[PDB]
Every structure is written in structure tokens, then in C-alpha cells.
Amino acid sequence: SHMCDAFVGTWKLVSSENFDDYMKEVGVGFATRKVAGMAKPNMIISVNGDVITIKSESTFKNTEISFILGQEFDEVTADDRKVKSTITLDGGVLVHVQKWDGKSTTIKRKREDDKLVVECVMKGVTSTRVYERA
């Protein structure tokens, strides 16, 4: 309980850096990169018992994942990858690893001041996405 209290809520995307290059590194094609790169999603995080739910409400895609920390699950990502995901808490940071086709990417979500900072890493390429409360 209370593991993710400071994450819970509705968050709106306010800045994105290097996201096109992250998507390229992941394998996303041109048209999806262009449309996905325009979107300014709301990320909605809730907790009920041990189950954490993260929704992304956007003009590109809507996505939803529900999970228990440390317990692998199937995820279809916004760019349509079918991945196996595991999310843990490490030092107060949500660490989300996605595995598909022999590849791996990691998404970290953390609270910093009044922001929720999302860092996406694929090999040498990082993208930083900053969200604020909606």
C-alpha cells in the first residue's frame, strides 16, 4: 500500500525531447512517428490494492495497462508492438522494461518537484517527456 501515492492522478504532457529519435531506435515507422509525435496525452495513474493502472488518453492512441509490481504482463504499445513488460519500483522510480523480438527498452517514471518525468531509453538513445498535473 501507498507505494505509488505521489504518482496517482491525471497528468498532461508539457514537453518532449528527442522523442523522434527514440521512436526511430525502437523501430517505429515514419507515419506513426509523425502522428505520435504531435500527441499531447494525458497519463492517468490509479491504484486499487496491489493493482496499478496507467492509462494514456490521446489523440493518437488510447492505451491502458494494469499490473502488479514485479509480475510480467502482455502489453500492446501505442505503436502496435506486442511486448512482454515488467514494472518494478526501484528507489521510488517506476521502472518499466519491455521485451519483444529480442529487443528491450526501458521507461522510467519519477516524481520531480511538481512534475512527473518520463525517460525512455533504447540502447544509446534517450527521450525525456515531462508531465504536469492536469
* 56 binds ligand QZI per the rule CB under 6 A: yes
CB 33 within 8 A of CB 27: no
Interface mask toward ligand QZI for 91-110; x: CB under 6 A: ----------------x---
Work out how close the CB of 1 gets to ligand QZI at its nearest, in angstroms, rounded to a whole number: 25
C-alpha cell at 92: 521510488
Q: Are strands 73-76 and 9-17 parallel, antiparallel or unpaired?
A: unpaired
45 binds ligand QZI (CB under 6 A): no
Per-residue contact string for residues 1-40; x = within reach of ligand QZI by CB under 6 A: ----------------------x--x-x-------x--x-
Q: How many helices (H) and strands (E) does the chain have?
A: 2, 10
* 118: contact with ligand QZI by CB under 6 A: yes
**Sheet containing 51-57: which strands, arranged edge to edge?**
62-67, 51-57, 42-48, 9-17, 125-133, 115-122, 103-112, 93-100, 82-90, 73-76
- Closer to ligand QZI by CB, 4 or 118: give it: 118
Number of Cβ within a 10 Å radius of residue 34:
12
Is 85 a residue that touches ligand QZI (CB under 6 A)?
no
Binding site for ligand QZI (CB under 6 A): 23, 26, 28, 36, 39, 41, 43, 56, 60-61, 77-79, 107, 118, 120, 129
